[PDB]
Design a protein around this ligand. Structure first.
Ligand SMILES: Nc1nc2ccn(CCCc3ccc(C(=O)N[C@@H](CCC(=O)O)C(=O)O)cc3)c2c(=O)[nH]1
Ligand SMILES: NCC(=O)N[C@@H]1O[C@H](COP(=O)([O-])[O-])[C@@H](O)[C@H]1O
Length: 200
């Protein structure tokens, strides 16, 4: 399956996906990396592996739907079957999300439903949980409707900061995201007709 990865930042997950899709048994290939922020560190990793890159400054579009269109254009150009949000920070329009229902995955640094939203690790430390994790889900319109593909739990050591906790969690993200991709791309896990995750 032809995959596009959308980044915004460092791109350590992108690298996680790049490494796994280059494995001989992989059911996916990363034909295009698309960032909405220029000069970001994840663009140089895409280039280092010879993957085409495109930058789409969200700041230059009237609204979201005109920004997503520019994205969906590139996605069609490279005949993309699967979209991977890996550090992508923009919210997506309803139409753009409906089009890729069942075909878009996101990696989130928390054990959803807990600590939704952007600053997951910040909330987790204020609440003071002993266990956090990451979640790979399908991107539905409501951030709490996405069907959950894989999760992995991570401990919260005493005296953790966002800088240390997020570092630990990312070692799981780098596991379950390549796996959840491989599930979806191989046609093993599929969003079912009833909208709940359907194994096969
Ligand atoms: N439609 C839909 N789109 C997306 C995109 C990712 N996800 C997965 C959920 C994780 C998430 C939670 C919160 C934010 C966020 O806060 N975005 C702001 C901040 C921008 C800034 O801080 O500059 C913005 O875009 O303005 C982003 C992602 C979904 C989803 O589930 N649904
Ligand atoms: N709201 C989405 C979100 O917070 N995504 C998070 O951003 C990081 C991406 O890091 P990377 O730039 O190393 O791939 C990851 O920790 C991921 O969970």
């Amino acid at each position: 399956a032809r995959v596009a990865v959308l980044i915004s930042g460092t791109g350590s997950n992108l690298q996680a996906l790049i490494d796994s899709t280059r494995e001989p048994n992989s059911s996916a290939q990363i034909d295009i990396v698309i960032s909405n922020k220029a000069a970001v560190a994840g663009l140089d990793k895409a280039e280092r592996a010879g993957i085409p890159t495109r930058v789409i400054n969200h700041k230059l579009y009237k609204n979201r739907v005109e920004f997503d269109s520019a994205i969906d254009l590139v996605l069609e150009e490279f005949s993309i079957d699967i979209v991977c949000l890996a550090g992508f920070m923009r919210i997506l329009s309803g139409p753009f999300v409906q089009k890729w229902n069942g075909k878009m995955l996101n990696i989130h640094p928390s054990l959803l439903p807990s600590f939704k939203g952007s600053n997951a690790h910040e909330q987790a430390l204020e609440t003071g949980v002993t266990v956090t994790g990451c979640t790979v889900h399908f991107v539905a319109e409501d951030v709490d409707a996405g069907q959950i593909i894989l999760q992995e739990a991570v401990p919260v050591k005493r005296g953790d900061t966002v800088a240390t906790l997020s570092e630990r969690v990312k070692l799981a993200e780098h596991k379950i995201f390549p796996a959840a991709l491989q599930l979806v791309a191989s046609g093993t896990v599929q969003l079912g007709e009833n909208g709940k995750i359907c194994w096969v």
